[PDB]
Amino acid sequence: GALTESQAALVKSSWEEFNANIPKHTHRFFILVLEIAPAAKDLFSFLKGTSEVPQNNPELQAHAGKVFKLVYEAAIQLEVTGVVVTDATLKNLGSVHVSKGVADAHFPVVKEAILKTIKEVVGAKWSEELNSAWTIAYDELAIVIKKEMDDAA
């Protein structure tokens, strides 16, 4: 697809729509996670010991926000520049994943959980051209973190 001017305009537009409601989209995101894969619950300090996904836990909100930000920034950088750039932060991300017991097979879990979350966020504006654009940008960003975990292992 590439990332045409017209595609990037479509991710930016759809991210601004996500951030517009963090405590919803983020608790949704964690439920789509636990639907796709229930065991994933023991991983999260803030979910351990609990029985249901807390809805106002700051630890959880802060966590999930940071995750979508990072995917959007990735799409812009792909249309301007043509790439996703690996920095200190992605590197540290890879460390903390490993300490907590996270593996690669866990990633399509969190992708489908983000596509399905953005398809839920944009609703009728949804196009092929836009699904194509978020897929490209997640795939391109996961390639980069998985890279850094393998390296923290």
Enumerate the known binding-site residues for heme b: 45, 66, 97, 100
Query: Would you list which residues are annotated within the binding site for O2?
Result: 63
Annotated binding site: 45, 63, 66, 97, 100
In the complex with ligand HEM, the residue whose CB is nearer, 49 or 123, is 49
Q: Which is nearer to ligand HEM, 69 or 125 (CB)?
A: 69
**Closest C-alpha to 37, from 121, 107, 131:** 107
CB within 8 Å of 25: residues ≥ 6 apart? 18, 64, 68, 117, 121
- The nearest distance, CB 138 to ligand HEM, in angstroms, is 6
Pick the closer one to ligand HEM by CB: 45 or 51.
45
Please report how close the Cβ of residue 36 comes to ligand HEM at its closest, in angstroms: 10
Measure the CA–CA gap between 86 and 100, rounded to whole angstroms: 21
The residues binding ligand HEM (CB under 6 A) are 40, 43-46, 62-63, 66-67, 70, 93, 96-97, 100, 102, 106-107, 109-110, 141-142, 145
Give the separation between CA 24 and CA 55, rounded to whole angstroms.
8
Q: Assess contact for 53 and 27: CB atoms under 8 A.
A: yes
